[PDB]
Structure 1
């Protein structure tokens, strides 16, 4: 079995997940949709590469049974490559709010100093979003099922194997294949959130201790509820996936900064999370995050 401390830890994480993960996307409303001079050529050509890896069609199912399908344009060499950005910023911002709420209900996170709470969320927001998204990913259809909204991968000229080149996509297939429990996903979220080596973290030693205990709890969970030799290296596979997810986080941050630079699209919350200015302490540069963290949890 697990210790009482370990059981309590899992209960609190699952509680937090239950209160703050809108798994059917019922409250995601009022989002935007695609509508009805030399060294910049190098930036644009790089941003062209940064976007045309992640191409999705968008499906909107109506209450009444009707379906709207959006197929995105071919790259004719212009603004059209940006057409999904407002929508993606709205969806990202929505997911980030849920992750902030997640962190806030966890006792161990609230007890950290506010600047560390900010630093950890800046560090982990993308990672936790991707972990939540994996739970709605259908590997058979290549589709993220977000209630009435779905995002379907548009196949490129190589096929299924050529899409697996793109690290974010490979990650979602690999993680989905492990067939994790709800409890194992939420422990993954905790391990990522409580990363002691994120930029700006002051209480490194406390965060390290916390991370270690979440990891130990995951390892024990696996030993007790999948005790057969088949799952002997599952914990280590999960940790390797967290390491890969961290690499992907870094690449994605850089892409976002490049796109933002030539076509502004980040919402104010996204600007704070990713280090963009629109105008001295961590608290004054992150006023929205700070407000969201000090507000009481519904």
Structure 2
């Protein structure tokens, strides 16, 4: 069974999730939409792997739908929108952290350092919960983002680590509690740059990990869920690698075509000079 401390820990994480995860995206509005040297550009074409169409269902019953263009200087038409969605998600993640007592008690410098290290990872973890793996679409209330079908199909889509990560994590069919513990483990990473209380964060991380392992042991006896704890930890390590690569991806794009919002600039360390 879970201890009283472990049950309290999960409850506080679920409470935070409940309060700060707008699962229907109802307060996401007033966002931008697409209109109605050489080596750096070629690497920036990295964007092709993440191609998505966009659907917006109106409250009145109307449906707007956007198919993006082929590559060739207009592969940036969707960046402002994605910047606005990412920003909206980041705010939710920041609120999540701030309502957790284990995070509130850390020094303000470590709070910021932990948020800059983990914001992308937490975003992806929340996005996985609205991912429909059958249709390859993220369902964000009135908005939907659907992967565009390419020559290799389902196989070729899994070559992009981000996309493969979303498919693999969804296949584990995790509970809400397991997702929120993944968020905690990722948030409380003692080895992010600029962390001062490395011992406290490490100990906290271990308690979340132990709580997740015990939750799984107590609630998932089936042969399918053997090694689930270790599969989850391997996915978080993978996600951290995806984070570092996609961070460099976004910074390269930002160098050629500015798109990052002020909040994104904060989290990515862009000063404005």
Q: Give the TM-score normalised by structure 1.
A: 0.90
Shift of 1:63: 1.1
Secondary structure of 1:52's counterpart equals helix
Q: Once the two structures are superposed, what CA deviation does each residue of 1:78-137 show, in whole Å capped at 9, x if it has no partner?
A: x31000000000000000000000000000000000000000000000000000000000
State which drifts further: 106-115 or 58-67.
Answer: 58-67
Asked whether the 8 Å contact 1:57–1:72 carries over to 2, the reply is yes
Q: For 1:194 and 1:277, how far apart are their aligned partners in 2?
A: 25
Shift of 1:42: 3.0
Secondary structure of 1:145's counterpart equals strand
Q: Once the two structures are superposed, what CA deviation does each residue of 1:172-226 show, in whole Å capped at 9, x if it has no partner?
A: 0000000000000000000000000000000000000000000000000001011
Structure 2: 5+ residue stretches without partners: none
State which drifts further: 208-217 or 66-75.
Answer: 66-75
Which residue does 2:77 correspond to in 1? 83
Shift of 1:43: 4.3
Shift of 1:21: 0.3
Which residue does 1:241 correspond to in 2? 235
State which drifts further: 179-188 or 268-277.
Answer: 268-277
How many aligned positions are there? 272
Asked whether the 8 Å contact 1:47–1:259 carries over to 2, the reply is no
Q: For 2:159 and 2:82, how far apart are their aligned partners in 1?
A: 22
Structure 1: 5+ residue stretches without partners: 279-298
Structure 2 CA distance for partners of 1:43 and 1:115, relative to 1, 3 Å: farther
Q: For 1:163 and 1:268, how far apart are their aligned partners in 2?
A: 31
| Structure 1 position 51 matched with structure 2 position 41 | no
Shift of 1:229: 3.8
Secondary structure of 1:120's counterpart equals helix
Shift of 1:231: 1.8
Shift of 1:47: 4.1
Asked whether the 8 Å contact 1:59–1:70 carries over to 2, the reply is yes
Asked whether the 8 Å contact 1:43–1:258 carries over to 2, the reply is no
Shift of 1:227: 2.2
Shift of 1:53: 1.2
State which drifts further: 157-166 or 245-254.
Answer: 157-166
Shift of 1:49: 2.6
State which drifts further: 156-165 or 91-100.
Answer: 156-165
Asked whether the 8 Å contact 2:44–2:252 carries over to 1, the reply is no
Shift of 1:270: 0.4
Asked whether the 8 Å contact 1:99–1:125 carries over to 2, the reply is yes
Shift of 1:158: 1.5
Secondary structure of 1:53's counterpart equals helix
Q: For 1:272 and 1:257, how far apart are their aligned partners in 2?
A: 13
Shift of 1:8: 0.2
Secondary structure of 2:70's counterpart equals coil
